[PDB]
A and B are shown apart, each in its own frame.
Chain A
Amino acid sequence: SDEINELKEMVKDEHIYDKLVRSIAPAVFGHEAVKKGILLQMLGGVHKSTVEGIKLRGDINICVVGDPSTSKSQFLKYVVGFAPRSVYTSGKASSAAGLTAAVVRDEEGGDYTIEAGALMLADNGICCIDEFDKMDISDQVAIHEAMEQQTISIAKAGIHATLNARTSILAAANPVGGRYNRKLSLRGNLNMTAPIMSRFDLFFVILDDCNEKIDTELASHIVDLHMKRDEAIEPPFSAEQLRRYIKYARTFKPILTKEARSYLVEKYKELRKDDAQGFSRSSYRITVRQLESMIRLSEAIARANCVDEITPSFIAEAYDLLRQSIIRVDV
């Protein structure tokens, strides 16, 4: 066809990294930091790893906390139709099953049967759960088990089960008071325990302000949308030609081949001496766990621009993306 030839024309463009980020969602304005991150979550990274042993990480997992009834809820509406087979669950029913995995009682010929829930059917699916504060104190290690590697285990009144929910989660919790303080860190305002945050990636929390200008332009931004028909806004791509485009993007495997790994190691070695502000400073010490994300995002951004190897120029946006958001942590 010519649509299969349309990709070959569209792969020979230049600013598609900047063309795509403007053409994500018409229901949002601005926030160009978090628009970059969700697109990398929309694609997949790499999963092939070392031999005879550990299977490493396969994806990234990003959250954004913010004040409720704001533009945080629009991406959650956006992704669940935009993504392949991706389910959405509030994650409030923390009693029977679902988020927590728990078998059913003896019915019609047997107990110990497997059950559904929004992790098992997210096998290469991008599930999205919100409202971290209102769950119980037991599941916060259960999904923490589900995050570090890609399998979960169960032995509740039956034999051990070897199931591997190949997942990539998306989160949006709530702050401790609904309004985010500025002079402090989010170590108080994370409203959870410590090691799941270090198990997580970084966030780019959405800020808030009441200015005379931004409310006026957002008012004009919403009325033509809330028109029955004012389709004067032009995304420079359509939905489905973007959808088949990433289906071409997933069929590579770029490998770092240059000697910028020697350039890479000094940056983290400089980085670890910053967030540790003392020998008795807090245990949010960004350790060797994050080095895997420090390269597996770094290949995925080059997997967006269809380049099969890693340059030291491409990891410039990789270093600061934690670092501009870790200085959001570090005051």
Chain B
Amino acid sequence: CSIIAAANPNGGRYNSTLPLAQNVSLTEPILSRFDILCVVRDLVDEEADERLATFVVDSHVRSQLNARQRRLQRQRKKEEEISPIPQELLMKYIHYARTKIYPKLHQMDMDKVSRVYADLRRESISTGSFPITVRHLESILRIAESFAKMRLSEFVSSYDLDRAIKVVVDSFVDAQKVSVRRQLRRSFAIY
């Protein structure tokens, strides 16, 4: 089975400056059985605020043989305002995106990740918020080949690894402290 979750802090999102053991009531070891911690932020904006505000108002405006298909043609344009690749068929191929294709790896594109696990674990023990172990790097290669399954390709490129790296390393560091600004000075060395 797969598990997603909908965690909720005790009040606001920044209930403390201190690490996440001070924030959530969930303790360490059960929390370490997950791979990633998606965290949200919203303080004060205007142009990013309207980008939701002018967006969500238009969603509420979305309230016989030919006419059966003309209603079906009405079903096309109601989800194709900006035409973002409609869900009439996109779910229809996930079912054999999961039961027909199996990926594999290579060996020449590996040892860049060796210092990634070692130094970042080193950088977060002296600054201990919540640790990483042998299983984080197991999740590193796992979500790497998740993307390559959507190329329907069975291989692993070079473009997918650093893609999959730069979705985990930033999403780990961006919940630390006031001293997230110092960690971002290390960040573009990965890129």
Contact = CB atoms under 8 A, between A and B. Distances in A.
Q: From B44, B46, B75, name the one whose CB has the most chain A CB atoms within 10 angstroms.
A: B44
Interface string B81-95: 000000100000000
Interface stretch (B21-29, B50-58, B115-123, B170-178): B50-58
Interface in B37-82: 42-44, 46, 49-50, 52-54, 56-57, 59-63, 75, 78-79
Which of A48, A56, A283 has most B Cβ within 10 Å? Answer: A283
B63 A48 contact: yes
Contact of B11 (A52, A195, A276): A195
Main DSSP-derived SS at the B contact region: loop
Given A253-B63, A269-B50, A283-B11, A288 B56 contact: yes
B53 A287 contact: no
Given A51-B62, A272-B49, 9 more contacts: A49-B62, A50-B59, A195-B11, A253-B63, A256-B60, A265-B53, A265-B57, A288-B52, A292-B60
A268 B53 contact: yes
Nearest to A46: B63
Contacts of B8: 195
Nearest to B53: A265
6 A-B pairs with the lowest CB-CB distances in the bound complex, closest first: A283-B12, A48-B63, A261-B57, A50-B62, A265-B53, A194-B11
Contacts of B62: 49-51
Contacts of B63: 46, 48-49, 253, 255
Interface string B3-39: 0000010011100000000000000000000000000
A279 B44 CA distance: 8
A291 interface: yes
Interface string B157-189: 000000000000000000000000000000000
A128 B84 CA distance: 43
A291 B46 contact: no
A112 B56 CA distance: 41
A20 interface: no
A131 B156 CA distance: 60
B11 A269 contact: no
B57 A51 contact: no
Contacts of A52: 79, 87
A165 interface: no
Contacts of B59: 50
Interface in A227-257: 253, 255-256
Interface of B: 8, 11-13, 42-44, 46, 49-50, 52-54, 56-57, 59-63, 75, 78-79, 87
A264 interface: yes
Contacts of A272: 49
Nearest to B59: A50
Interface in A290-316: 291-292, 295
Contact of B61 (A255, A269, A276, A292): A255
A268 B79 CA distance: 27
Contacts of A292: 60
A132 B44 CA distance: 33
B18 to A, nearest CB: 15
Contacts of A255: 61, 63
A56 B65 CA distance: 31
Contacts of A295: 57, 60
A127 B90 CA distance: 41
Contacts of B43: 279
Contacts of B13: 283
B50 A287 contact: no
